[PDB]
């Protein structure tokens, strides 16, 4: 039903109203209690990046990118695991790489539960600027593959 209308992801469905949510397909008294809770427990974390010396960067000098995970929702309980046997805490992976060369620049695990900070350093080669992409991938939920493209040097 969703493919025949033009909605595929959860963000394209969570942006509707309560009547619109129940007006797309069938609904039940228990689905609303669990569906609403799953959406509240999903990671609603925004991105925030900072680069130091974007123009004053040369070849050889190490560069760092600071990433702040601005979470706009409170964390109440672990991730939803209807099929997973163990209750595990959600994790994060702040990974930066090359979208074309397919080279992983850096990656660091993160567990905040709130607005935290993560710093990652790397070394850039010569021959001017390099176009890097910063991605945030979790290990427990989809729909949060936030990719930001930028360049340094």
From Swiss-Prot:
Top-level taxonomic group: Eukaryota
Subcellular localization(s) per the UniProt record: Nucleus
Tissue-by-tissue expression: Widely expressed.
Residues with Phosphoserine modification: 30
Record family assignment: Belongs to the helicase family. SKI2 subfamily.
Subunit structure: Component of a core complex containing at least PRPF8, SNRNP200, EFTUD2 and SNRNP40. Component of the U5 snRNP and U4/U6-U5 tri-snRNP complexes, building blocks of the spliceosome. Component of the U4/U6-U5 tri-snRNP complex composed of the U4, U6 and U5 snRNAs and at least PRPF3, PRPF4, PRPF6, PRPF8, PRPF31, SNRNP200, TXNL4A, SNRNP40, DDX23, CD2BP2, PPIH, SNU13, EFTUD2, SART1 and USP39. Component of precatalytic, catalytic and postcatalytic spliceosomal complexes. Component of the minor spliceosome, which splices U12-type introns.
Recorded domain comment: Contains two helicase domains. The N-terminal helicase domain has catalytic activity by itself, contrary to the C-terminal helicase domain that may have a regulatory role and enhance the activity of the first helicase domain.
Functional description taken from the UniProt entry: Catalyzes the ATP-dependent unwinding of U4/U6 RNA duplices, an essential step in the assembly of a catalytically active spliceosome. Plays a role in pre-mRNA splicing as a core component of precatalytic, catalytic and postcatalytic spliceosomal complexes. As a component of the minor spliceosome, involved in the splicing of U12-type introns in pre-mRNAs. Involved in spliceosome assembly, activation and disassembly. Mediates changes in the dynamic network of RNA-RNA interactions in the spliceosome.
Disease / disorder: Retinitis pigmentosa 33: A retinal dystrophy belonging to the group of pigmentary retinopathies. Retinitis pigmentosa is characterized by retinal pigment deposits visible on fundus examination and primary loss of rod photoreceptor cells followed by secondary loss of cone photoreceptors. Patients typically have night vision blindness and loss of midperipheral visual field. As their condition progresses, they lose their far peripheral visual field and eventually central vision as well.
UniProt name for this protein: U5 small nuclear ribonucleoprotein 200 kDa helicase
């Amino acid at each position: 039903r969703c493919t025949d209308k033009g909605v595929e992801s959860v963000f394209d469905i969570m942006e509707m109203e309560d009547e619109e949510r129940n007006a797309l397909l069938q609904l039940t008294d228990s689905q609303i209690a669990d569906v609403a809770r799953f959406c509240n427990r999903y990671p609603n974390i925004e991105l925030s990046y900072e680069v130091v010396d974007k123009d004053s960067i040369r070849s050889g000098g190490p560069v760092v990118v600071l990433v702040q995970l601005e979470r706009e929702e409170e964390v109440t309980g672990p991730v939803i695991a209807p099929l997973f046997p163990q209750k595990r805490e959600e994790g994060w992976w702040v990974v930066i790489g090359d979208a074309k060369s397919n080279s992983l620049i850096s990656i660091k695990r993160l567990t905040l539960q709130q607005k935290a900070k993560v710093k990652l350093d790397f070394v850039a080669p010569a021959t001017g600027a390099h176009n890097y992409t910063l991605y945030f991938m979790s290990d427990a939920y989809m729909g949060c593959d936030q990719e930001y493209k930028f360049s340094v040097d």
